[PDB]
Every structure is written in structure tokens, then in C-alpha cells.
Design a binder for this molecule. Structure first.
Ligand SMILES: COCC(=O)Nc1ccc(O)cc1
Length: 149
């Protein structure tokens, strides 16, 4: 059938919200009140890949944008980018591996591991207004997920 998707937001375990940082980056900052409209709404797609009770393969697209989080090599290490795709072809059930995250439930939170790069996770900094990155400590790898209409 058609790939299944849900709209959602993510916050890090320090309750920082994610926002756009120019066209191909996200940043995390403390947001409350009217400013919470700046937060990115994801379309989380449930994709093909290796699955267990608490390991669920997803893609993270920006709602109604042909942009996906992807894990791509740079300076010889796994890194997080926003990548444009053909809007005719996405989302799809068989997403390419660079777009796949294992959504893992650990102690009432979520971690998003790169399917491509084992043990590299979507991360934030403790400081305000710094990029979201891929991290292999002080950095934050746990999130909560709010399901949106
Ligand atoms: C199949 O997913 C089960 C579940 O409880 N997921 C979950 C959702 C939001 C959150 O903040 C923590 C965990």
C-alpha cells in the first residue's frame, strides 16, 4: 500500500524545540508560547528495514516539503544533512538507507540511530541555538515526540 506517515514534533530531553537554521540545517532552542509556531513539524514515515519491539525504522521529512534528514559522509565521519528529493517519488516505503533512522524507545524517551551508521544518533548541544548533528556524554541523544493533527 502507500507508506504510512504521521505528523509530529520532537523535543530534546532538555525540552529544546527544533527550528530551521537557514535552508539545510536545523537548530535547537528553548521555545515557549507564541514562538512555538517556529518549530519544525515532521512527517515521520514508517519505512522498510530491520525491526524489533523497540527498534522501528523511520524517515524524517519536513511536513509538506521535499526535504528529509539524511546521514552522509563528510570529513570522514557520519554527519546529519537536510536533503532535497523529487516530490513526485517521496515519501516511499523503500527509502534509501541514508534517510533511515532506527527510532528506539529507551526509558520513556526516544533515540534516533542512523541505519547507515550504527551507533551515530541525532544529537543536540546543551547550548542554545546550535545545530542538530549526528553524534557517536554532554551532548543530548534522547527526545520526546508530540503527535500533531
Ligand atoms: C510505538 O511507539 C510507542 C511509544 O510509546 N512511543 C513514544 C512516543 C512519544 C514519546 O515521547 C515517547 C515514546
Amino acid at each position: 500500500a502507500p507508506v504510512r506517515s504521521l505528523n509530529c514534533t520532537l523535543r530534546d530531553s532538555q525540552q529544546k524545540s527544533l527550528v530551521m537554521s537557514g535552508p539545510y540545517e536545523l537548530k535547537a532552542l528553548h521555545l515557549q508560547g507564541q514562538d512555538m509556531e517556529q518549530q519544525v513539524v515532521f512527517s515521520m514515515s514508517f519505512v522498510q528495514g530491520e525491526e524489533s519491539n523497540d527498534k522501528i525504522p523511520v524517515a524524517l521529512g519536513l511536513k509538506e516539503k521535499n526535504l528529509y534528514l539524511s546521514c552522509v559522509l563528510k570529513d570522514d565521519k557520519p554527519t546529519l544533512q537536510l536533503e532535497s528529493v523529487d516530490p513526485k517519488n517521496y515519501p516511499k516505503k523503500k527509502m534509501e538507507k541514508r534517510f533511515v533512522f532506527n527510532k528506539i524507545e529507551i526509558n520513556n524517551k526516544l533515540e534516533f540511530e542512523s541505519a547507515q551508521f550504527p551507533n551515530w544518533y541525532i544529537s543536540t548541544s546543551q547550548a542554545e541555538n546550535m545545530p542538530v548533528f549526528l553524534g557517536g556524554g554532554q551532548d543530548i541523544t534522547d527526545f520526546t515526540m508530540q503527535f500533531v493533527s
